[PDB]
Ligand binder design. Sequence first.
Ligand SMILES: Cc1cc2nc3c(=O)[nH]c(=O)nc-3n(C[C@H](O)[C@H](O)[C@H](O)COP(=O)(O)O)c2cc1C
Ligand SMILES: Cc1cc2nc3c(=O)[nH]c(=O)nc-3n(C[C@H](O)[C@H](O)[C@H](O)COP(=O)(O)O)c2cc1C
Lengths: 173, 173
Amino acid sequence: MIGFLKKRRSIRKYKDVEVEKEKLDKILKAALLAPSSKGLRTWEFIVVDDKEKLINLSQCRTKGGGFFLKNAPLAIVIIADKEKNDVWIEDASIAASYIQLQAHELGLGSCWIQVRNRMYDDNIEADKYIREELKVPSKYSVECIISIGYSDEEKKAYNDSDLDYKKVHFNNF
Amino acid sequence: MIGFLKKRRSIRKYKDVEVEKEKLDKILKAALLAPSSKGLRTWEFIVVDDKEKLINLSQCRTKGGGFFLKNAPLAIVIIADKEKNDVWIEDASIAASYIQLQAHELGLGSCWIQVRNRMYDDNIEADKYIREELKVPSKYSVECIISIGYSDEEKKAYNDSDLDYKKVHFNNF
Ligand SMILES: Cc1cc2nc3c(=O)[nH]c(=O)nc-3n(C[C@H](O)[C@H](O)[C@H](O)COP(=O)(O)O)c2cc1C
Ligand SMILES: Cc1cc2nc3c(=O)[nH]c(=O)nc-3n(C[C@H](O)[C@H](O)[C@H](O)COP(=O)(O)O)c2cc1C
């Protein structure tokens, strides 16, 4: 598990290879098993493998952040029913991380694209642009997009020298 | 891994047994390996095993939420430097999920205690109460407490049938 996590690096460049149905199905199962506040499961997942839609979504932040989505084979857009609970950010973040870890176990690379609190441009929220592109009703907000694919880039694993132990406090700050 | 996650259930009743140092250490290593926005690692961790501190912290929401913490052998309070990034909520949430998963792999139970957006009572934020209790400077915000220990209650594992496929959308909402 520690070694599993040391090998998890964010991947932004992917082989031209589709994510198999069998793998996508396990990733979704992991997402649906995420602990949520009050067990309410505020999240919903939009699976995107249509190439033109992925191109559209890669522009969700015109000043950058998700451009590499254009050449990913798969994305899961994580949204949340913000009316149902006010810790939907937590809920969606936990599901996101489960998606990414399950993908890592299946030999896939992934990257989180931040949407919440990000601008599409000076006039429009990234949340708004994604809801238009995916026909999402206004009661939902978009937390993030996780792009998923077979890695086409080299990244080093973390090791124990990367661990910032100064960030651990005992019984008080 | 899906089997791993199906057996992960929140635990709020614990054996009267310390969490041994070798397991604490692996839990902290998983937390320190968590992906963060811009690699900024806005979070910090306060390990609490002092019984009196645990009692104090179990009162952080006087109307309920973390009362069981008084009977836990261990807690990790996840705080974040909220001036470092605005998505410290996400950062902290991912680290807390890594903590809970590594606790699970080591045969321990755990439970998330929500702090952000929660009140100590009608006048005081739970965040502010905890920062006073743990002497946390004001630039930090408290995300949640993870109580950790050996489980003293039985919990049914999740089923394939428990999964919410209504929450999966393909190519559009
Ligand atoms: C964001 C978040 C906040 C939570 N806050 C609390 C809490 O304050 N008190 C508590 O007893 N459980 C809390 N939980 C645990 C949930 O009750 C639990 O994860 C959910 O009911 C699913 O049940 P399970 O974890 O046993 O599978 C929280 C969970 C999440 C994801
Ligand atoms: C909350 C969060 C938001 C992120 N948003 C983006 C993003 O918008 N664009 C991007 O390219 N990477 C994003 N990342 C990945 C980060 O750049 C970060 O460096 C990475 O998670 C840490 O490096 P690593 O995953 O390779 O270990 C995000 C990560 C987190 C935790």
